[PDB]
Every structure is written in C-alpha cells, then in structure tokens.
C-alpha cells in the first residue's frame, strides 16, 4: 500500500473508496507481480501473452467515473484477473462479467469465490449479455472500433457506460450516458488499451505507418525466398 | 465495345440489367460531370467536399452481388446522388435509404421524387432504420470500423449485406450472410471508400503521419 | 451570402470589393454545390476528378493581393469554373485565361458570355500565353515545382505575379514582383493546391513517406502475383 | 507428436536432453502461465512489465547451440525466471547468473535455492562478472548495441558466447568464438529480444515514429 | 583492368577518349582526395559542405551521352572543381560554365586559367546564360524540379541537354532533345545528385520525416 | 579569424585559450576548405567520402570540457586531419592518437611533424590503445553504440572521457568521469557524428523509418528484376 493512499484520496464515490480500501489486490495478482499491488500504479501488468491488467490508477478512475452505488446491476466486459470485478461486487447488487479468453476465465474462476453476486460468463464480450439484460452500468477493459452496440442496447435508459474507443495504438476513454440513439459522449482522455476481440471487434490490423512498414519488411523478407 | 456495354455484359441479375438499361445516370449527375455518365466507368466521382459517388463498374458490381429480386425490402446506407437507389427501386418492392449529409439529402431528394417506392431518411445510416426493421438486403456505400451492428440486426435471417470493412485507405469489400451471431463473410476484393460517419461509425481520423507532422510544424508557430 | 460580408470587409482593393459584391458565384457553381456560394468559405469545392476550385477565402485574398485596377492586362493560369476570371474581368481592361483540361474548358465556355474582355485559351498554362505578351498581373491556381518561367517572362517589368510553389502536398503562396532576374518573393503563407500539369509541371510523384509507403504497399501487392 | 517431444528430438547435446527431461518448467512459471510450460512452445512469455522469458523452442535451441559440457564455468546474463539457469546447473560445474531487475531477482532467487552450483548476482550483467573471470560459455537473453565487451573479455580463448546483436525490433542471433580481437561471428538467424540495460547497454530507445509523434501531439497540449 | 582503363573502353566519343587521356584529374582534386583521381571511380567526392563532384564513371558517361564535337558552344551548369569543364574545353570550341557557390567558383577559377575557351560565370545557373544564347549542348550537374526552362530556351533547335529531373533522393537522368515545346526525354537511368539552387531551383527541402520530427522534439525544448 | 574571437571568448580553460589562438587551423585543412578555418564555425567539413571534421564550435567546446592541463597523457580516438590533436599536444605532456582509415592516417602523418609528443596509431580506435595504458583524458570524434569499453578501461581512476553515444542519426555528447563501474555520465547535449567503426562499433545499419523505407525501396527496385 504505497500509492494506495494517493489513489484513495482522489476517489469521489464513497462506496468505491471503501471497497478500494478493503479488497486486497495482491490476492488477484500472480506471484511474479506481488510487488505491484500498490506500487507502479500507472503501469499495466502482464498476465497472458498479449493481455494486460489495466493500470490501477486508470481502473480506479474509470470505476469512480462509473457512478457505482447500492442495488445496481453492472455488466463488465473483460473479467481478466477479477480484481475490478470484486470492487464492483462490493458496491453493487449484482454483477454480470464476461471473459473471452479461456485461460483467463480459468485463472479467475477460483479468485472470486467469496462473492455470491457475480455471474461469470465465458464468451464474446462484444455481445454483452442479453439474458440479464437491463444493466445500470457497463465497463469495458479493452478498446473497440466503435461504440459497442450490444452493451449499449443492454444499458438502462439513463444508464452510464465507460469504454475506450479507437483503432490505432492510442485510444480515447469515453463516458456514455444512454439517451435513445442520441447518447452524450464525454471524452475522458487518451488511453492505451489492447484490442477487444469478437463479432464487433477488429477486422484488420493496426494501421499506423510503423505497423505498415513492419509488414512490408516482413513480406520482402519472405519474397526474398524467390 | 461501349463502356456502358462492357458493364452490361457482366451483370448477372436480369432485373438489374433491365434497370441499368433504362435509368439515365446523366440526370443524377451535375452539369460539370455529365460527360462521365457512362464514360470513365472506373472513376469515383466528386460530389461534395469529402463525398464521391462510387465508380459505375463497382456500383453495378455491388448491386449485382447483392442479388436483388422483386418484392424485397432493401436498406441502403448512403443515398448519395440517388442513382443506385433508383436502380434498386426499379427492381425491388420497397427501398429505405439513409443519407447523413443534408446537402446531399436535398440534392437527391429532388431527383428521387419520380419514384414512389423509396423512403428517404435524412439521418444516421449507422443506426440503420429500426421502424421497417425486417430487410432482405442491405448495401453500404462507405467503409466501417466493424460489422455494422444495427443494419445487421435488422436483416432477415438469411439476408445479405454488402459493405466494406476496414480502417485505412484500402478496405475489403464484404458480402455478409446473416446466421445469428456467426455471419459468413466473403471477401469480394479490395476497395477504396470514404469513412462512414455516425454513432457506430469512426471516432478517429485516417492515420496520415505526413500531415500529423505538418500540423505539429504549423502548431509550432508561436513566438511569445 | 453568409460569410460574404466577413470576406468583403477584409478586401483592401475597392474595385475588387465592388466586383466581389456584384458577381453571383452560385452562377458558376454546379447544382450540387449551390449551398457553398458563400458558406464554408474555407473549403475547396469538387468539380472534376482530381480538380477543385480554390477556397473563396483564399481566392479573394489572392486577388486582393494581386493589386488589380483599371486598364491592366491580366494573365490567369487555370480558368476552372470561371468565377475568379469574372471578378478580374470586372476590374481590368483585358483578361487572357488558360485552361489545360478540356472538360473544364467546356464547362466554363458558356458561363462567361456576359463578358467581352476575356480571351479563353485551351492549352498548357505552364507556357503562359506569349501572344498577348505584356501582362500587368498573373495569377496561377495550382502549385508548380518552381517559379513558372513563361508567365514570369511574359510579365511587365514591374508586374506582379501570385502563385503557389512547392512539390509535396502543402506549398507556399508567393507574391512575385518582377525585377529582371532578381525578383522579390514574398511568402504569403502555407496553402494546399493541386499540381499544375504541363511542360514545366511535375515529372515525378509526391515524395512524402506516406506516398512512398502507399507505393511500396502497391508493388508488394502486385509482386505477390509471383 | 508432443510439443515437448518435438523440442526434445532436436536437442543435440545429450546432457541438455537429459536435463530438459527432468527439470519441471511449470515450477518456474507463475500460476497464470503454467498451461504454457510445454504448450505453445514458440511464444515468449510475459513476466514483468517489459520482461518476457524466451520462448522454449528458442531457449533450448540457444542452450543447445551453446554446446554445454560437464565441469564448465558458465556466465548467464539475464537470469529471468530461472528455468534456463536450472538446465545449465544440471549440466555444468558452476554457473554465475546476473539479473539487473530486483523484482525478477527475488522471484528467481526463491526457486533457485534448490541448486547449489549457481551464483546469483543482482546487478549489471553488461559488466559480466569479473571476479570469476575465466568462463567457458556465456549466454545473453537480451539484444545488445555491439559485441558485449566485458563478457567477451571474460571468455576463455576459445570460448563461446551466444547473444543477439542489433538495434531495432528484429535482431540477429550470434554465436561468437573468442579469438583475441577478431572473434568469429556466426549468424544463427533473426530473433526478437528486449533491449539489454546497463553501463554497456542501450542509451537510446527504439525508434518508433508513430509514438514519437503521438507524444509531440500530447506535448502540444498547453493553452496559456 | 585499370579502373581508369575500364572507363576509357566505354567512351564512344573519340574526342572525349583523347581528352580523358590527357587531362589530369588529380590536379583538380584536393590533397585529401588525390588517391581518388582514377581510383574508386564510382564514388561521388566531397568538396564543400553539401557539394560533391560527380563520380567519374557517371561523369564520363554523361559527357559521352552528351555527344560533344569540335566547334560547338556548350553551356555547363555547375562548374564544381572544373574537371569535366576541362574535358569539354579540350573537345569544344567555346564553353560557358556557371557556378552559384563563390567558394567553389574561386577554387575552380585558379585551375581553369590554363584554358582559354572557357567563360566562368559566378551566378545562377538556373537562369542559364542569355548573353551567348545559342548553345549546342547543355549539361547540368544537379537535379531540378522540372525541365530547366532557361537553359532549354537557350538551346539550338536540335540541341541536347542532359540533366537529372526529380524531387527525392533518387532522380532520373534525362537526355533532352529540343523540339519546340515538345522535347523528347530519354531516361538514361537513376542517379543521385544534389538539389540545384537558384530562381528556377527548389523552394522546399527534401522531405525527411525522421529529421522533421527530431527538430519538432528539439523545438519542444522550452520550459516557461 | 572571423568567428575566432567569438569562440575564444567562451573558452574556460586558459591553456586551451592559448593553444586555440596559436595553432593555425588552415594548416590542417585542404585547399578547397581554406575559407572555413574560422568561418561557418558550426558546420562539419568534408574530408573523405563518409568522413567529416567536427564543427569547430563543437570541437572547442568538447576540448574545453575535457579539462586539459600540463603533464597529462591524453588518448584521442579519431585523428582525422590532426587539428584537434595539435591543440591537445600544445597543452598536454603526451598524446596517443588513433585513426582507423588509412587515407586519413596518411593525410595527417605530415601535418603534425612540428610536434614531438604525439604518437600516431593506424588501427581500430574502438580498442583504444592498451600499450600507453593509463590515460588522464580521452576524446572520441565519432558516435558509438554504447560507452566505449577499452578507452574507459584505459582511463585513470578519476579520469574524464568525452564521446558521442547513440545509434540513430542524432546522438548525445557525454562527459564521463571514471569511478569503478559506477561512472558519472553528464549529457552535454544533442550532436550529430558519423559512426565509429571497429570491433565495438556498429553491427547493423541505421534504424529510423527513413532508412528502413529507403531500403524497402531499394529491394523492391531489385526484386522487380524478377
């Protein structure tokens, strides 16, 4: 708990403040990363090849902006290691959380036993989760090509959704308040999340000149097979 | 052979062939572009800043790959000058067409008055059009970040949607056949369409670093 | 006439001010662009594939800087839709105007009938127009690799020429005052014009890394035919 | 065949084959990564931010190209999770291994207690390890700007060092045989290792212009 | 064979062959570069910051493709060290040569005193040289944005001009034959010359984005 | 001597100030570059294909920062034209100087005759020079991939070394004060030197997107041979 007090001081939602103080984040982190429970708070931690855990400073900010309170039903796209799932479960009535990667799904299955209000789904988060349909809030922990349609449809009328939108290696964090097909979108800043996979995920690779050149270099390397 | 003739020979959809043969593309085109009606069939044509009507060869090819029939209900996203909308209205029962740009909407509204089975919505085509929900066919004249959810939802279970998906200056043309949440995607080839706007459209601009630097150089113009 | 008054207020040449107020720019614009006669004044309008009409704000600024007055002979490289041609004809004695694109030449042939002091040439503007040789002013509506030599030679001794010079997708607007082979060149700012074609036009394509990469990507796409 | 088996078949160094067969890689790996012990043998595995343990196929290939024997003195630069260190300690007399990252040092320190012929230095591997100076073999798990001088100096006259040399995202894997100031360098192929740190390490970051611009755009965020 | 000999064998212009054989290139070259007179014939040689004399093989090749004869009037744009000017003066009647850089002008002025049919103008070669207007041949030792108008105007009706045209680090070598306003342009291959300066020269720098960013990064060095 | 007084005014080491005033730099420069002895002081001068002489302003700054005084033994990596070698010889007891390029080695052999305290070696400067081992100072006139190990080892304990470190076309000037394996490195600024060659020199080419693209363009040009 080094940068723990810094982060706690900033929390605007009293309920989140308490959940944050109580849940021991080292309990959801592997052995190798134990020292990052409350230190290096601005970095994303490696869990699986190609998959990280959002930076604590970012995560707490997002949840704080989610306006979480008693008796809400929250949909979370991207269970991961279950830590942010736990913090929501502490505040909210029920939590439906989706994970697309099986190994990740397995790793967390055991870590959330202490909770009886978290439904863990193994599937395409891009579809959200129809079946417990009306949600009060939705948090996505990976960037999308556009506004995720299913989650948005599943949101309650005045619901609030937070997700990173953007193709390209640097995206934008958006706070969406449902209002028919005229939501209000508030850019909360620049962020760098990994790409969400699935039906409404990405259909082509990163399109920045660095990537394009890396590819050219890959192909010429292989064409020189001729 | 005649450029108009070359395109006609390729058309596999009989009705499309008949429509293509009687609808005058030169009426939908501005004064400055009438020489292009059936000449230079491979060139996209400039209508508004940032808006071009698809090149004829590709336009017909897409309407043809769309497999249009009589009695169908079609959803067209991106009216434009109205030409392809006209061809569809000649073949199909009813046609709903959305145009997000008002200046383009107006222009095409005048020309589409002739037809009576065309509903022109001035709005976000990225939302499709819920109110007539069941559609047999969907065509999109602009590239999208992913599979367009709303129009796809509004498709019949075996429906066909044709759209370009991709970020970047060269996208892929897809032929999608609705099958619940596991659509079949056929790549019909590489195309170059403008980016689609709207709620479920793009939120970032094309990544051209030359210009991103240019600007930063300009921005660096301040001496205090 | 929305941004019309903004633009008119700025005009320093009284004669231009009057011509600008009188000539109806919607009369030279196609149907599709009627709403841009005096709105969106900063954008270039699409007329032909690869060809635009300079932005009104830019055009009026250029003509205003041309120092146009009674009894001058003006050479204009790039007739286009004839609108800027009309404004000059209103002020000046005679106007010789060149257009290299035939379709463009045709479109404007009819739109300038009301004038009896505009000679319309279909040819290589890069050559200027020898035959009505001594000119007082010259305006070019497209960028060149360097100072256009023929127009410059055709200029009167103290004549003034305005043109965009530059390879690359962003050029510079120059006001040239003839003085033997020691002109005075004043950079009026950064601009973005399409490339001028012709003998003294461009001999190679755009050389910015974006273009070069687009090409590499084109070739590798075709080499993969092997 | 079994991925673990495929790698085993390639091993030319008998002792390495035996070691690979009895050392349990799943002990060195974190909970979240144990399924990868002998599965997906071609993937580098994420341990700390900016630190990955080499993909098994390459790891073994390098230890094998290293030509390990009994009684040797080996210098390993970049302990990591300790796995390859363990394999070396099973084959060789003594092993000195350096790790510059403390969090990584600790993690591997616990697991390496089992062995008794391994000396773990928490420090700059770029300096090698003077104090045991004569070494028969040297392995480096990270790319370097040039031939690493200190470790090379500390090699026996016919010693072998295996390291990746190169700036950029794709380096070359070199097998170096000490011969005074004219070493022989064999290119074993292209690899992708992280940059080595320390005194004789890198002083500039990888040149990614996309990000260099991104930042400059961010930096340009000030309105006074 | 001898590098000097290899070049000699290729020369098709008898007079050029004779001249090449008697003019000592080592006199025109600085102390630090005399070993290069007829050695490393393919390398451009550094004379002033931003100024290099063309590599011999190319230099001769161009003078040879120029088709020099006795009695002609030649216009050379870019004197340089004077070597190729000397070879031309040995073959032709009169030679006008322009050099825009004064430091280069001086250097070559001393060495060219020997010849008496060479007029050295210290000025804008981009303007050519009106005063002796009719020229049979024109050579340009630097790349240009377009066909150089002034020198082209000053050519005889069937004259030949050899210049590199192009923006970018690799230009095309052109052989131009005057034919009113429809010259014939033969592409002799790709070359790498410096950019030509002057009125009808370049107005923008080579577009190197690496450096454009570098600077912007430097520029971003202010903390107020 | 135009910018000579500007540069002299700045010199903090009195001994360097005197050496700088006395040694005639035009005596080490070829004919073509005579006018740059004390003018255009910020540019690097062309001597051999691929090889330049550091800018005078840079060179004097580096030597001034080297803290040169009576009775020191100085190792210099990159003799070049011998001018900076001469200035050091004037102040110091002995100077060992290495040059890797033979033509360069030859050109300077004759220019330093007036000195009897300069040992000129033709070899790999990356190795420094073991044999006159303990050095008080070391100056390198070319960039290295990292801290040059041999020179550093050859430095006296509290010795000082100055060299440009960096891959990439723009490097950093470093002032190194020996202290075991814990030197103190002070960045003196951004500089642009040519690459040092040799055992501890570079093993791969420049890695900036400009270079990478130039290469792609080279290969595609050659693949189109197929």
Distance CA F128, CA F140 (A): 10
Our CA-based measurement puts residue B51 at a distance from the nearest CA of chain D, in whole angstroms, of 28
Residue numbers in E near B209 (CB within 8 A): 209
- Tell me which chain D residue has its CA closest to the CA of residue B224: D224
- Asked if E26 and E53 touch (Cβ cutoff 8 Å), the reply is no
Task: Provide DSSP, chain E.
Answer: --HHHHHHHH---HHHHHHHHHS-HHHHS-GGGGGGSSSSTT--EEEETTEEEPPHHHHHHHHHHTT--TT-EEEEE--TTSHHHHHHHHHSSEEEEEES-HHHHHHHHHHHTT-SSEEEEES-GGG--GGG--EEEEEESSBBSS--HHHHHTEEEEEEEEEEE-SSSSEEEEEEE--TTS-EEEEEEEE--PBP-STTS-SS----HHHHHHHHHHHT----
- Asked if F17 and F11 touch (Cβ cutoff 8 Å), the reply is yes
Nearest Cβ partner for D209 among B209, B219, B220? B209
Distance CA C138, CA E218 (A): 40
CB contact under 8 A, D213 and E213: yes
Q: 């005193």: which residue's tokens?
A: E113
For chain B, state the CA radius of gyration.
18
For chain F, state the CA radius of gyration.
18
Q: Which residues of F touch E (CB under 8 A)?
A: 30-33, 35, 40, 43-49, 81, 103, 107, 169-170, 190, 208-211, 214, 217
Residue numbers in C near B30 (CB within 8 A): 30-33
The CA-based diameter of chain E, rounded to the nearest angstrom, is 70
Q: How far is CA A188 from the centre of its chain?
A: 15
Q: 């796209």: which residue's tokens?
A: A77
Q: Which token pair is A169?
A: 């290696």
Give Cβ neighbours of residue A22 (< 8 Å, ≥ 6 apart). A90
Q: Which residues of E touch C (CB under 8 A)?
A: 124, 127, 144-147, 149-150, 165-168, 171-172, 181, 183, 199-204, 206-207, 209
Long-range pairs for F14-21 at CB < 8 Å and ≥24 separation?
A: F15/F68, F15/F69, F15/F70, F15/F90, F15/F91, F16/F60, F16/F63, F16/F64, F16/F68, F16/F87, F16/F91, F18/F90, F19/F86, F19/F87, F19/F88, F19/F90, F19/F91, F20/F60, F20/F87
- Asked if B217 and E205 touch (Cβ cutoff 8 Å), the reply is no
Which of D39, D40, D44, D46 is best to mutate for the A interface (most A CBs within 10 A)? Answer: D46
CB contact under 8 A, A44 and D49: yes
Phi, then psi, of B70 in degrees rounded to 5: -80, 145
- Asked if A198 and C195 touch (Cβ cutoff 8 Å), the reply is no
Q: Which domains does chain B have, with CATH numbers?
A: 1-224 (3.40.50.150)
Rounded to 5 degrees, what angle do the CA atoms B158, B164, B166 make?
A: 125
- How far is the CA of B56 from the CAs of B6, B20, B52, B139, in angstroms? 11, 10, 12, 15
The CA-based diameter of chain B, rounded to the nearest angstrom, is 70
Task: Provide DSSP, chain B.
Answer: --HHHHHHHH---HHHHHHHHHS-HHHHS-GGGGGGSSSSTT--EEEETTEEEPPHHHHHHHHHHTT--TT-EEEEE--TTSHHHHHHHHHSSEEEEEES-HHHHHHHHHHHTT-SSEEEEES-GGG--GGG--EEEEEESSBBSS--HHHHHTEEEEEEEEEEE-SSSSEEEEEEE--TTS-EEEEEEEE--PBP-STTS-SS----HHHHHHHHHHHT----
SS3 content of chain F, % helix, strand, coil (to 5): 35, 25, 40
Nearest Cβ partner for F208 among D127, D201, D207? D207
Among residues C215, F167, D189, F30, which one has the least CA distance to residue A213? C215
- Tell me which chain A residue has its CA closest to the CA of residue D208: A210
Residue numbers in B near E212 (CB within 8 A): 213, 217
- Tell me which chain D residue has its CA closest to the CA of residue B218: D220
Q: Residue F217: how many CA atoms within 13 Å on its side-chain side?
A: 17
Q: 């070879």: which residue's tokens?
A: E87
- How far is the CA of C84 from the CAs of C20, C78, C79, C129, in angstroms? 9, 10, 8, 18
Residue numbers in F near A217 (CB within 8 A): 212, 216
Our CA-based measurement puts residue F33 at a distance from the nearest CA of chain E, in whole angstroms, of 7
- How far is the CA of A74 from the CAs of A88, A160, A175, A180, in angstroms? 8, 10, 15, 19
Our CA-based measurement puts residue B15 at a distance from the nearest CA of chain E, in whole angstroms, of 51
- Tell me which chain E residue has its CA closest to the CA of residue D215: E217
Task: Provide DSSP, F79-96.
Answer: -TTSHHHHHHHHHSSEEE
- Which chains border E (3 or more CB–CB pairs < 8 Å)? B, C, D, F
Which of F213, F216, F223 is best to mutate for the C interface (most C CBs within 10 A)? Answer: F216
Distance CA A178, CA A155 (A): 7
DSSP state of F143: B
Task: Provide DSSP, A15-61.
Answer: HHHHHHHHS-GGGTS-STTGGGSSSSTTSPEEEETTEEEPPHHHHHH
Distance CA B104, CA B131 (A): 23
In residues, how long is chain A?
226
Q: Counting beta carbons within 10 angstroms of the beta carbon of residue C180, is it exposed (0 to 12), middle (13 to 18) or buried (19 or more)?
A: exposed
What is the dihedral sign for C-alpha F3, F9, F12, F15? positive
Q: 């970049």: which residue's tokens?
A: D78
Q: Other CB atoms closer than 10 Å to residue A196's CB: what's the count?
A: 24
Among residues E74, E60, E72, E78, which one has the least CA distance to residue E19? E60
- How far is the CA of F33 from the CAs of D168, F44, F56, in angstroms? 38, 11, 13
Pairing verdict, β E184-191 and E171-177: antiparallel
Angle between the N-to-C axes of helices E14-22 and E83-91, in degrees from 0 to 180, rounded to the nearest 10: 130
Angle between the N-to-C axes of helices B209-219 and E209-219, in degrees from 0 to 180, rounded to the nearest 10: 30
Distance CA E210, CA F216 (A): 16
Residue numbers in D near E216 (CB within 8 A): 216
The SS3 assignment for F103 reads helix
Which of B204, B212, B222 is best to mutate for the D interface (most D CBs within 10 A)? Answer: B212
Distance CA E213, CA C135 (A): 43
Distance CA E167, CA E202 (A): 9
- Give me the residues paired with residue F46 across strands: F52
Q: Counting beta carbons within 10 angstroms of the beta carbon of residue C222, is it exposed (0 to 12), middle (13 to 18) or buried (19 or more)?
A: exposed
- Asked if C33 and C24 touch (Cβ cutoff 8 Å), the reply is no
SS3 content of chain D, % helix, strand, coil (to 5): 35, 25, 40
Experimental method: X-ray
- Tell me which chain A residue has its CA closest to the CA of residue F218: A220
Q: Which residues of B touch E (CB under 8 A)?
A: 209-210, 213, 216-217, 220
Distance CA C141, CA C98 (A): 11
Q: Other CB atoms closer than 10 Å to residue C192's CB: what's the count?
A: 17
Nearest Cβ partner for A223 among F209, F212, F223? F223
Q: Other CB atoms closer than 10 Å to residue F226's CB: what's the count?
A: 8
Distance CA B173, CA B166 (A): 9
Q: Which token pair is A139?
A: 């948090």
Q: Which token pair is B54?
A: 């698809």
Interface size A-B, in CB pairs within 8 Å, comes to 67
For chain A, state the CA radius of gyration.
18
Residue numbers in D near A217 (CB within 8 A): 170
H or E stretch including F21? Answer: helix F14-22
Phi, then psi, of D165 in degrees rounded to 5: -115, 130
Distance CA D108, CA D82 (A): 5
- Which chains border F (3 or more CB–CB pairs < 8 Å)? A, C, D, E
Task: Provide DSSP, F201-221.
Answer: S-SS---SHHHHHHHHHHHHH
Nearest Cβ partner for A200 among B146, B168, B201? B146
- Give me the residues paired with residue B74 across strands: B95, B137
Nearest Cβ partner for A167 among B124, B145, B172? B145
CB contact under 8 A, F146 and D147: no
Nearest Cβ partner for C213 among A212, A219, A220? A212
- Asked if F207 and F170 touch (Cβ cutoff 8 Å), the reply is no
Our CA-based measurement puts residue C203 at a distance from the nearest CA of chain A, in whole angstroms, of 26
Q: How far is CA F10 from the centre of its chain?
A: 20
Q: Which token pair is E33?
A: 């570069």
Task: Provide DSSP, D206-224.
Answer: ---HHHHHHHHHHHT----
Distance CA A40, CA D101 (A): 14
Q: Which token pair is C114?
A: 């009301």
Distance CA B71, CA B91 (A): 8
- Which chains border C (3 or more CB–CB pairs < 8 Å)? A, B, E, F
Our CA-based measurement puts residue A178 at a distance from the nearest CA of chain F, in whole angstroms, of 44
Distance CA A162, CA A139 (A): 5
Our CA-based measurement puts residue D140 at a distance from the nearest CA of chain A, in whole angstroms, of 21
Our CA-based measurement puts residue F59 at a distance from the nearest CA of chain E, in whole angstroms, of 17
């Amino acid at each position: 708990a080094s940068e723990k007090e810094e982060i706690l001081r900033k929390i605007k939602t009293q309920e989140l403040a308490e959940a944050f103080n109580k849940v021991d984040r080292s309990l959801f982190l592997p052995e190798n990363l134990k020292d990052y429970a409350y230190a290096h708070t601005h970095e994303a931690l490696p869990i699986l090849p190609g998959i990280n855990t959002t930076a604590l400073n970012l995560g707490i900010f997002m949840l704080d902006e989610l306006d979480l309170h008693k008796g809400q039903k929250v949909l979370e796209i991207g269970t991961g290691i279950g830590y942010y799932t736990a913090l929501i479960a502490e505040i909210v009535d029920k939590v439906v959380s989706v994970e697309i990667n099986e190994k990740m799904y397995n790793y967390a299955s055991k870590l959330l036993s202490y909770y009886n209000n978290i439904k863990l789904i193994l599937g395409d988060g891009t579809l959200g989760y129809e079946e417990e349909k009306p949600y009060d809030r939705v948090v996505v922990w990976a960037t999308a090509p556009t506004l995720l349609c299913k989650p948005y449809e599943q949101l309650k009328e005045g619901g609030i959704m937070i997700l990173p939108i953007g193709v390209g290696r640097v995206q934008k964090l958006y706070k969406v308040i449902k209002k028919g097909n005229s939501p209000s979108l508030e850019n909360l800043g620049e962020v760098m999340f990994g790409r969400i996979g699935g039906l409404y995920g990405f259909y082509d690779d990163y399109d920045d000149i660095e990537f394009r050149v890396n590819k050219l270099e890959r192909q010429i390397k292989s064409i020189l097979d001729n």
